[PDB]
From a paper:
As a proof of concept, we used this platform to identify both known and novel L- and D-amino acid peptide binders to the well-characterized model target, streptavidin. All peptides bind within or near the biotin binding pocket of streptavidin formed by two surface loops [1/2 (amino acids 22–28) and 3/4 (amino acids 42–52)], and by antiparallel β-sheets involved in an extensive polar interaction network, in which residues Ser88 and Thr90 of β-strand 6 play a major role. The surface loops of streptavidin are flexible: upon biotin binding they undergo a conformational change to form a closed conformation, but to accommodate the peptide ligands, loop 3/4 is dislocated by 13–16 Å from the biotin closed form to adopt a well-defined peptide-specific structure. All eight L- and D-peptides discovered in this work bind to the same pocket of streptavidin in distinctive binding modes suggesting (1) the rich malleability of L- and D-peptides and (2) the ability of streptavidin itself to adjust the flexible loop to accommodate multiple peptides with diverse sequences and conformations.
The same stepwise evolution approach was followed to identify hotspot D-amino acid sequences that bind to streptavidin. Two 5-mer hotspots, “wqeea” and “lanvd”, were selected for the extension step with all 160,000 possible combinations of D-amino acid dimers.
Numbering used by the authors:
A (entry chain B), B (entry chain D), D (entry chain C): 15 to 134
C (entry chain A): 14 to 135
The structure:
Amino acid sequence: AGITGTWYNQLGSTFIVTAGADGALTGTYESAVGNAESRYVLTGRYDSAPATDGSGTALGWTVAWKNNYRNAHSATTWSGQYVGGAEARINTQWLLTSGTTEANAWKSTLVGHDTFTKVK
Amino acid sequence: AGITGTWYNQLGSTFIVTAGADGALTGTYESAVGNAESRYVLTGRYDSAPATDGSGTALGWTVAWKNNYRNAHSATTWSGQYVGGAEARINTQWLLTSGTTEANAWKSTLVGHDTFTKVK
Amino acid sequence: EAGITGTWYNQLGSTFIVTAGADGALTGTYESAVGNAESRYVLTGRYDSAPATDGSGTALGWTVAWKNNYRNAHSATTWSGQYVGGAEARINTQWLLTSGTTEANAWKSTLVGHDTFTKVKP
Amino acid sequence: AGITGTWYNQLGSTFIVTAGADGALTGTYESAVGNAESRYVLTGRYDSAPATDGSGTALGWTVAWKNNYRNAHSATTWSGQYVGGAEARINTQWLLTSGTTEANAWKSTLVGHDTFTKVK
């Protein structure tokens, strides 16, 4: 499957994941600094039987930005695909929703993209 | 938390979820038809200690579209917030990524918005 | 024919007046429900001027940069969607608002949402 | 403004744009992907008086995918910012909506991200 392990995004945020045999993703997400106060639980799912035609392996995961140290009252989901080989990558787009009042709900959600690599 | 229960989106797709003490979301997602072939595992995260200022509760979850009957080689993440009160609602935006070759990756990801309530 | 020219409202009452040109152009203004001049901005976009005849909607999109003579938010929004005809005509959209940021803050430059418009003032 | 010119995205699509003094963007777009041939008209807007604090210049534009050669019954909008630097760049995210039936509207909209430089 090639997904289990440590991954690094374009700015060095660190995605630590186990791809279980049942299609589960479990792990932690943290900043490039690597300090414990920046580390959060993640969970998600992946395609455990992907195509063997050069297509990527679809996956997604969520972090709610609450840990024992802080709480941003927000959650990010990453949706994307793992691409194997000598240029291995996880290519994602993400949605970060903050808890808001209804009056501020129109501006609750940020969107962006993250590309993860196996080396920093 | 108010999140545990059976929810329906605007097209009747059915989200059966449990919100655990630790911030975990677990459950299943299926079509309005309610047939076993359309039912899939989900996992996610939510803010287990939301603000007390009238803001919503941030959350997200993932389904990989593989079960014992079908594999679409794709995964969806929903990112949103739970809004409590008279009529509880979960307002989300979602990203559905299909596994693609690199040449087709431009058309890998659909986006939309789902609103869930506890009534069909 | 196209059904798009005129005034559209979301449920919060933000309002746009648009002309759908025979050339595929969209031109008009976007404003708040209050309708004061400080809230009104130039809108420009494009639509499919020869849509399918199979019951499909009409694809369209437009941009507003949030600068006018009275304010500048240093940002722009694009709405991408489709027009759906009938007595309760609707424009169903999703949108992206990008704010000018430094590179360090670029990860948080872009909001996403959805807007549905109808011809009936709320 | 720095915006006026010929730009290319990461896939080699060609974005030929003029930034008018009135905040207008006009020009043509030639797509390296999809149901597309030759140039398509674009129009959009940009911030003609950007902040002077090091921030980029917000802008957006639309292409409806109809020209004299073909009609994909769809439209893309790009929302982003121009980043003046050593190597000027326009970083965008985009939404491509197809005209669909109501039953297919859930899968009407693709999302992605394009980065443009004046060097191909």
